Amino acid sequence: LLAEHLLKPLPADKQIETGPFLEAVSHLPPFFDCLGSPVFTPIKDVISGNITKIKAVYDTNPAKFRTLQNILEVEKEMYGAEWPKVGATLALMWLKRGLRFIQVFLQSICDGERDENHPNLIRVNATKAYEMALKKYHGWIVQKIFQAALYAAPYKSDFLKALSKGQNVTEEECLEKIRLFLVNYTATIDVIYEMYTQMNAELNYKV
Amino acid sequence: LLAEHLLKPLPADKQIETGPFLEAVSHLPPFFDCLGSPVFTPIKDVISGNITKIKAVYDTNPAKFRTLQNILEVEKEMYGAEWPKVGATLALMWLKRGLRFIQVFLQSICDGERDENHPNLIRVNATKAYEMALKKYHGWIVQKIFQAALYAAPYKSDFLKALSKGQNVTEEECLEKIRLFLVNYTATIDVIYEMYTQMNAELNYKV
Numbered sequence: 001l002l003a004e005h006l007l008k009p010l011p012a013d014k015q016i017e018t019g020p021f022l023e024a025v026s027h028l029p030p031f032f033d034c035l036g037s038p039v040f041t042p043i044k045d046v047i048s049g050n051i052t053k054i055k056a057v058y059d060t061n062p063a064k065f066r067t068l069q070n071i072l073e074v075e076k077e078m079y080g081a082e083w084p085k086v087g088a089t090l091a092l093m094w095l096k097r098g099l100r101f102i103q104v105f106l107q108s109i110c111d112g113e114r115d116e117n118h119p120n121l122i123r124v125n126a127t128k129a130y131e132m133a134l135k136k137y138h139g140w141i142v143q144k145i146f147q148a149a150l151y152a153a154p155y156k157s158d159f160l161k162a163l164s165k166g167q168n169v170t171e172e173e174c175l176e177k178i179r180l181f182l183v184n185y186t187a188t189i190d191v192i193y194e195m196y197t198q199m200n201a202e203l204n205y206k207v
Numbered sequence: 208l209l210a211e212h213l214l215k216p217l218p219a220d221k222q223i224e225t226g227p228f229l230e231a232v233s234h235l236p237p238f239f240d241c242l243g244s245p246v247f248t249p250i251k252d253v254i255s256g257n258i259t260k261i262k263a264v265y266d267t268n269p270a271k272f273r274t275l276q277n278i279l280e281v282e283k284e285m286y287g288a289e290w291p292k293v294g295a296t297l298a299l300m301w302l303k304r305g306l307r308f309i310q311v312f313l314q315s316i317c318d319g320e321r322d323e324n325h326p327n328l329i330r331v332n333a334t335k336a337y338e339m340a341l342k343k344y345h346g347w348i349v350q351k352i353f354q355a356a357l358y359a360a361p362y363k364s365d366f367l368k369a370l371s372k373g374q375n376v377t378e379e380e381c382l383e384k385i386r387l388f389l390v391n392y393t394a395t396i397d398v399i400y401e402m403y404t405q406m407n408a409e410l411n412y413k414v
């Protein structure tokens with residue numbers, strides 16, 4: 001149930017408190033265990049791992065790492081020339097990309113983007129999310145692994161069904177709750193991308 | 208370095224002490240982080256997860272769960288009709304299959320099985336291991352994911368190189384240490400398979 005854990009709104013100064021953020025996004029990886037296939041469990045674990053790494057660094061000193069901007073600027077100072085490919089900065093660099101993937105996927109579904117010829121699939125939505133969020137950073141083996149995983153994707157009706165877990169709500173109602181979640185989720189992700197740009201903390205290497 | 212953590216020999220009564228076993232096989236999953244690609248990290252984590260689950264159950268009562276046979280017979284009693292698809296029995300059911308995969312792969316390399324036309328690849332060895340250990344239990348998406356991952360497989364020379372980490376030893380020496388490790392490793396795995404048969408604890412479902 002996405003809109004039961006809305007993200008906070010951005011404050012005027014656009015600084016994101018680390019503790020609240022981590023707590024919010026930590027409700028996202030489990031969803032990957034209700035998409036119908038064990039092919040997604042490794043994906044839960046990849047995104048959780050990013051979250052766990054940021055929390056581990058935050059837990060060393062919450063006041064020093066109070067906001068996400070604090071994390072980047074502090075680690076830049078701590079690590080010198082190995083930064084930004086170290087620590088929580090690297091974990092959040094990759095986290096923002098998974099989060100962005102989810103954002104683009106959910107927004108595509110809610111904007112009614114679909115394959116007219118195969119309308120209860122979610123493949124076009126996942127393929128667009130992947131091209132926007134992830135593909136730039138994956139070598140061809142991983143891109144092939146994505147293309148294989150796409151076939152385990154559930155039908156759209158089943159996917160919406162699992163997002164409400166059985167609430168007996170119309171798809172229309174379901175999509176409206178998703179639109180609501182997307183408000184502060186997109187705004188937050190955009191601010192994390194903008195901070196990576198302003199700090200020159202973004203790297204373009206492929207895996 | 209495989210032969211620095213040899214498995215114990217089997218005792219006369221062919222009972223495998225749980226603590227020692229777990230400690231031994233826990234040196235195996237890290238190796239997946241030195242094969243040259245992030246495609247294997249999810250694999251480290253899948254096998255570690257099986258090991259972690261068995262240890263978690265063992266830690267509740269070491270004396271009740273002293274041997275692997277103890278685990279199966281105790282859980283059969285604890286869980287009734289959900290057994291063998293529960294608890295440490297299910298974790299070890301899947302563990303033995305990963306361990307068997309590694310065994311068949313290493314033994315194939317050491318027996319000189321190779322593609323004459325592509326002699327410094329390890330693909331035929333991985334494909335045989337997969338067919339012997341795993342394929343029976345994978346649906347076609349996962350089989351496709353395996354076929355994609357096969358392309359991240361290192362060259363044989365690099366793989367042997369990483370097993371000695373840089374020891375300046377001939378491949379011949381390397382393979383002889385692997386043959387030595389394989390003695391008590393194969394014997395132990397075979398006893399775990401035989402216990403699954405004798406207990407009727409083996410399930411054939413696909414993922």
Ligand SMILES: CCCCCCCC/C=C\CCCCCCCCCCCCCC(=O)N[C@@H](CO[C@@H]1O[C@H](CO)[C@H](O)[C@H](OS(=O)(=O)O)[C@H]1O)[C@H](O)/C=C/CCCCCCCCCCCCC
Pocket residue numbers: 028031032035042043046047049050051053087090091092094097098099101102105122126134142145146149150151152153154207245246247249250341349352353356
């Ligand atoms: C709430 C709604 C849910 C929305 C989702 C519904 C979608 C359903 C639709 C379609 C299904 C199709 C598949 C969808 C795929 C979903 C993708 C979600 C986003 C995933 C994000 C992946 C990010 C990524 O590429 N990561 C990559 C980079 O990770 C980072 O690497 C860094 C070093 O360069 C660091 O190590 C870093 O670690 S840390 O310590 O700094 O934290 C670490 O996190 C990571 O390598 C890729 C992971 C994906 C797995 C690819 C490999 C799979 C191998 C499979 C092998 C199996 C073969 C075995 C056969 C028996």
Ligand SMILES: CCCCCCCC/C=C\CCCCCCCCCCCCCC(=O)N[C@@H](CO[C@@H]1O[C@H](CO)[C@H](O)[C@H](OS(=O)(=O)O)[C@H]1O)[C@H](O)/C=C/CCCCCCCCCCCCC
Pocket residue numbers: 038039040042043134142145146149235238239242249250253254256257258260294297298299301304305306308309312329333341349352353356357358359360361414
């Ligand atoms: C020391 C020497 C090292 C030797 C290895 C060198 C090999 C190098 C050669 C070639 C490389 C080619 C790939 C090689 C593959 C190696 C395979 C190693 C053995 C792996 C064993 C897999 C076992 C397996 O199939 N497991 C399956 C069943 O697991 C069990 O499921 C149970 C329920 O039915 C339980 O949940 C159970 O959990 S527990 O709680 O009870 O413990 C759990 O462990 C498991 O589903 C399969 C895992 C493999 C990953 C497949 C999915 C990958 C998805 C990738 C998605 C990425 C897409 C994202 C794109 C951005």
